[PDB]
RNA sequence: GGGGAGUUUGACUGGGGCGGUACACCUGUCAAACGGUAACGCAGGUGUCCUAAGGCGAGCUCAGGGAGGACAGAAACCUC
């Protein structure tokens, strides 16, 4: 059949967005250290609304990206607590789906009384071999039409691989 | 120390004074497809700021919009 149309997870991005900066944000950074085995990166204050206590140039959220077998393992750990029920509204038109979970105690982490209670967003992006064209510098080119992931293809791949159930939104 | 002595009381201006600076320097139109071209013609500005907001080299692409993700809501952060 298709020679090299096998779908594959390009990366898995975890993101923890807290309200205020300080000790809680530092702890939300420490939790990702043991969750992903790598140092996260801080994102801060794209704007200034002041309606809930943020300003310009203030550390707000932490995030990171995992690729490869570790990304697949983290996605499996997330779908474990998710129990493999995804809604129809979780999938985007491009083929990327995210679910989000509750506080990270259900992932299999030893609870620490000093860290606190934080969750993550757990956004997943799907890909195919050949999507690295739009990322290189020597020559840039669009993906195309028959190669880009569709809407139904993502949920079909999810049902085929992880045997999850798709609920109507 | 106007008791006394000397001298001055800017210019433009639809009379003069008051008002204003068209009195020094810029942007667009007036301005009639080279340049130049007036009115107290119009619409606006300037007497500052920067050891970086100068120089070089590298990396990246912005404003906005569309579809998604726990608290998240028109606007928080992540991804396409
Ligand atoms: Mg006299
Ligand atoms: Mg006169
Ligand atoms: Mg002429
Ligand atoms: Mg001329
Ligand atoms: Mg350059
Ligand atoms: Mg581009």
Curated annotation (Swiss-Prot):
The modification Phosphothreonine is found at residues 36, 39. There is a cross-link at residues 30, 44, 146 (Glycyl lysine isopeptide (Lys-Gly) (interchain with G-Cter in SUMO2)). The modification N6-acetyllysine is found at residues 44, 77. This is Large ribosomal subunit protein uL5. Its main location: nucleus. It comes from Mus musculus. Component of the ribosome, a large ribonucleoprotein complex responsible for the synthesis of proteins in the cell. The small ribosomal subunit (SSU) binds messenger RNAs (mRNAs) and translates the encoded message by selecting cognate aminoacyl-transfer RNA (tRNA) molecules. The large subunit (LSU) contains the ribosomal catalytic site termed the peptidyl transferase center (PTC), which catalyzes the formation of peptide bonds, thereby polymerizing the amino acids delivered by tRNAs into a polypeptide chain. Keywords: Acetylation, Cytoplasm, Isopeptide bond, Nucleus, Phosphoprotein, Ribonucleoprotein, Ribosomal protein, RNA-binding, rRNA-binding, Ubl conjugation. It holds the Pfam family Ribosomal_L5. It comes from the Eukaryota. Component of the large ribosomal subunit (LSU). Part of the 5S RNP complex, which is a LSU subcomplex composed of the 5S RNA, RPL5 and RPL11. Component of a hexameric 5S RNP precursor complex, composed of 5S RNA, RRS1, RPF2/BXDC1, RPL5, RPL11 and HEATR3; this complex acts as a precursor for ribosome assembly. Interacts with PML. Interacts with MDM2 (via its RanBP2-type zinc finger domain); negatively regulates MDM2-mediated TP53 ubiquitination and degradation. Interacts with NOP53; retains RPL11 into the nucleolus. Belongs to the universal ribosomal protein uL5 family. One of its GO terms (cellular component) is cytosolic large ribosomal subunit. GO terms for biological process: cytoplasmic translation; negative regulation of proteasomal ubiquitin-dependent protein catabolic process; negative regulation of protein neddylation; positive regulation of gene expression; positive regulation of signal transduction by p53 class mediator; protein localization to nucleus; protein stabilization; protein targeting. InterPro entries: Ribosomal_uL5, Ribosomal_uL5_C, Ribosomal_uL5_CS, Ribosomal_uL5_dom_sf, Ribosomal_uL5_N. It is found in: Nucleus, Nucleolus; Cytoplasm. Disulfide bonds: none annotated. Signal peptide: none annotated. The keyword Ribosomal protein applies. GO terms for molecular function: 5S rRNA binding; structural constituent of ribosome; ubiquitin ligase inhibitor activity; ubiquitin protein ligase binding.
